[PDB]
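Q: Predict the assembly, please.
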Amino acid sequence: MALVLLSFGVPRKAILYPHEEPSWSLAKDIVFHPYWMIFGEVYAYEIDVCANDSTLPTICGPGTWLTPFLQAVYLFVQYIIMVNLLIAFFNN
Amino acid sequence: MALVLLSFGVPRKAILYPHEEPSWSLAKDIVFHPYWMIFGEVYAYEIDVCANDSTLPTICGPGTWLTPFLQAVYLFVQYIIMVNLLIAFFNN
Ligand SMILES: CCCCCCCC/C=C/CCCCCCCC(=O)O[C@@H](COC(=O)CCCCCCCCCCCCCCC)COP(=O)([O-])OCC[N+](C)(C)C
Ligand SMILES: CCCCCCCC/C=C/CCCCCCCC(=O)O[C@@H](COC(=O)CCCCCCCCCCCCCCC)COP(=O)([O-])OCC[N+](C)(C)C
Ligand SMILES: CCCCCCCC/C=C/CCCCCCCC(=O)O[C@@H](COC(=O)CCCCCCCCCCCCCCC)COP(=O)([O-])OCC[N+](C)(C)C
Ligand SMILES: CCCCCCCC/C=C/CCCCCCCC(=O)O[C@@H](COC(=O)CCCCCCCCCCCCCCC)COP(=O)([O-])OCC[N+](C)(C)C
Ligand SMILES: CCCCCCCC/C=C/CCCCCCCC(=O)O[C@@H](COC(=O)CCCCCCCCCCCCCCC)COP(=O)([O-])OCC[N+](C)(C)C
Ligand SMILES: CCCCCCCC/C=C/CCCCCCCC(=O)O[C@@H](COC(=O)CCCCCCCCCCCCCCC)COP(=O)([O-])OCC[N+](C)(C)C
Ligand SMILES: CCCCCCCC/C=C\CCCCCCCC(=O)O[C@@H](COC(=O)CCCCCCCCCCCCCCC)COP(=O)([O-])OCC[N+](C)(C)C
Ligand SMILES: CCCCCCCC/C=C\CCCCCCCC(=O)O[C@@H](COC(=O)CCCCCCCCCCCCCCC)COP(=O)([O-])OCC[N+](C)(C)C
Ligand SMILES: C[C@@H]1CC[C@@]2(OC1)O[C@H]1C[C@H]3[C@@H]4CC=C5C[C@@H](OCCC(CO)CO)CC[C@]5(C)[C@H]4CC[C@]3(C)[C@H]1[C@@H]2C
Ligand SMILES: C[C@@H]1CC[C@@]2(OC1)O[C@H]1C[C@H]3[C@@H]4CC=C5C[C@@H](OCCC(CO)CO)CC[C@]5(C)[C@H]4CC[C@]3(C)[C@H]1[C@@H]2C
Ligand SMILES: [Ca+2]
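A: Predicted assembly structure:
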C-alpha cells in the first residue's frame, strides 16, 4: 500500500508542480495528499484543477488533465483492491 | 478504540493550543475531532496548519509540524487495524 502511494504521489506532484526548486517540501508533497485519500478524503475540488469550481486554479497548466486519470486508478487499487484484501486477510 | 482516541486527541490539543486556561472546553476538544475521524472526516485543511491552504493559519506555531505525523499514525490504527479487527470480529 505504501508503494502504490508513491507510485501516485510522484507523478501528481511532477505534473501539477513543474517549476520547483529542490526542497524537503517535495518529500512531504509526494506522500501527504495520497495518504489522506486512503482515509476518505478525495480532495474533490483539487481534482481537475482546470475546472471552474477548482480551488487550485493557478495550478492549471500543460498536461494537468492526466491527474484525474491517475487518481482514479490509485483509489481503485487502494480501496477496492488493497483495503478489501486487508479485510479479507484479517477475516481468514 | 476509545483509548487510541485519547492517545491522539490530548497531544494534538496540547501541541496546537499551547496557551489555554483551564476550561471544560478542553474535555470537548480532546475528544471531538478525533471521534469524527473514525467516520470519514479527515479535516484535510486543518492538517498541517502552517500550510498555505490551511483554514487554521493562526494556529501555526512552534512544533505544530508534529500533528500530521500523529494523525497519520492515528488513522492507521483506527481504520486499518481496529475497524478491520471489528469487521473480522463480527464475521467470525
Ligand atoms: C502494520 C505494519 C506496517 C506499518 C508500519 C509500522 C511497522 C511496525 C512493525 C512491523 C513488524 C515487522 C514485520 C516483519 C518484518 C521484519 C523487518 C523487515 O522489514 O523485514 C523484511 C524486509 O523488509 C522488506 O522487504 C521491505 C522493507 C520496506 C519497509 C517499509 C515500511 C512501509 C510501511 C509503512 C507504513 C506506510 C503506510 C502507508 C499505507 C497505508 C523481510 O522480513 P525478515 O526481516 O526476513 O523478517 C520477516 C519474518 N521472519 C523473521 C520470519 C523472516
Ligand atoms: C516514504 C518516503 C518519505 C520521504 C523520505 C525523505 C524524508 C526526509 C526528511 C527530512 C526532514 C528534514 C528536513 C527539514 C529540516 C527541518 C526544518 C523544517 O522543515 O521544519 C518544519 C517542520 O519539519 C521539521 O521540523 C522536520 C520534520 C522531521 C521529520 C521528518 C521525518 C523523516 C523520516 C520519517 C520518520 C517518521 C517517524 C517513524 C520512523 C520509524 C517547520 O516549518 P514548516 O512546517 O514548513 O512551517 C513553517 C512555519 N513555521 C516557521 C511557523 C514553522
Ligand atoms: C514506521 C513505519 C514507516 C512509515 C513509512 C514512512 C513514513 C512517511 C515519511 C515521510 C517523511 C516526512 C515527510 C516530510 C519531509 C520533511 C518536511 C519539511 O522539511 O518541511 C515541511 C514540514 O512538514 C512536516 O514536517 C510535515 C510532514 C508531512 C506529514 C507526513 C505525515 C505522514 C503521512 C504518510 C505516512 C505513510 C507513508 C507511506 C510511505 C510511502 C514543510 O516544508 P518546509 O520547506 O519546511 O516549509 C514549507 C513552508 N509552508 C509549509 C508554509 C509551505
Ligand atoms: C459496544 C459497546 C461500547 C460502546 C459504549 C456503550 C456500552 C453499552 C453496553 C455495553 C455492555 C458491557 C459489556 C460487558 C462489560 C460490563 C461492564 C464493564 O465495564 O465491565 C468491565 C470493566 O470495564 C473495564 O475494564 C473498562 C472500563 C472502561 C469503559 C469505558 C467505555 C469506553 C467505550 C465507549 C464508547 C466510545 C467510542 C469511541 C470509539 C469508537 C469488566 O467486565 P466485567 O464487569 O467483569 O463483565 C464482563 C463479562 N462478565 C460479566 C462475564 C464478567
Ligand atoms: C472520554 C473523556 C471525556 C471527558 C470527560 C470529562 C467530562 C466533563 C463534562 C463536563 C460538563 C459540565 C461543564 C459545563 C457546564 C455547563 C455549561 C456548558 O458548557 O454549556 C454548554 C453546553 O454544555 C453543557 O451544557 C454541558 C454538557 C453536559 C454533558 C457532558 C457529558 C459528560 C459525561 C458524558 C456523558 C455522556 C452520555 C453517556 C453516559 C453513559 C452550552 O454552551 P456552548 O455549547 O459552549 O455554546 C455557547 C453558546 N450559547 C450560550 C448559545 C449556548
Ligand atoms: C456510554 C458509553 C461511554 C462513551 C464514552 C465517553 C463519551 C465521551 C464524553 C465526553 C464528555 C463530554 C465532552 C464535553 C465536555 C463539556 C463541554 C462544555 O462544558 O462546553 C462545550 C459545550 O459542548 C458540548 O456540550 C458538546 C460536547 C462535544 C460533543 C461530544 C460528542 C461525543 C464524541 C465522543 C464520543 C466517544 C468518546 C470516546 C472516549 C474517549 C463548549 O465549551 P464552553 O466553555 O461551554 O463554551 C465554549 C464556547 N464556544 C463553543 C463558542 C467556543
Ligand atoms: C490512450 C488511451 C485511450 C484514450 C484515447 C483518447 C486520447 C488519446 C491519447 C492521448 C492524448 C494526448 C494529447 C491530449 C492533449 C490535448 C489537449 C492539450 O493540449 O493538453 C495539454 C498538452 O498535452 C500534451 O502536450 C500531451 C502530452 C503527451 C501525453 C502523453 C501520453 C498520455 C497518455 C498515456 C499514454 C496512453 C496509454 C495509457 C494507457 C491507457 C495542455 O497543454 P497546452 O497544449 O500547452 O495547453 C495550453 C496550456 N496553457 C494555456 C496553460 C499555456
Ligand atoms: C526521529 C525519526 C526520524 C526523523 C529524522 C528527521 C527529523 C529529526 C528529528 C527531530 C527533529 C526535531 C527538530 C525539528 C524542528 C525544526 C524546525 C523548527 O524549529 O520547528 C519548531 C520548533 O521545533 C522544536 O523546537 C523541536 C521540538 C523538539 C521535538 C522533540 C522530538 C520530536 C520527535 C520525536 C522523537 C523522535 C522519534 C520518534 C519515533 C519515530 C518551530 O518552532 P520555532 O523554532 O520557534 O519556529 C518559529 C515559530 N514562530 C515563527 C511561530 C515563532
Ligand atoms: C525508492 C523510493 C523512491 C522515491 C523516494 O523514496 C525512495 O526517493 C527519495 C529520495 C528523496 C530526495 C533525496 C534528496 C533530495 C535533495 C534535497 O535537497 C535539499 C534542498 C534544500 C532544502 O530546503 C536545501 O536548502 C531535497 C529533497 C530531495 C529532493 C528528496 C525528496 C524526496 C525523495 C525523492 C525520496 C522519495 C520518497
Ligand atoms: C484516564 C483519562 C485521562 C484523560 C482524562 O480522562 C481520563 O482525564 C480527565 C481529567 C479531566 C480534567 C479534570 C479537571 C479539569 C478542571 C476543570 O476546571 C474548571 C475550569 C473552568 C471551567 O470553565 C472554571 O470556571 C476544567 C476541565 C479539566 C481540565 C478536565 C479536562 C478533561 C480531563 C483531562 C479528562 C480526560 C478525558
Ligand atoms: Ca468515507
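The radius of gyration of chain A is 14 Å. Chain A touches chain B at residues 32, 35-36, 38-41, 43, 55, 83, 86-87, 90-91 (CB under 8 Å).
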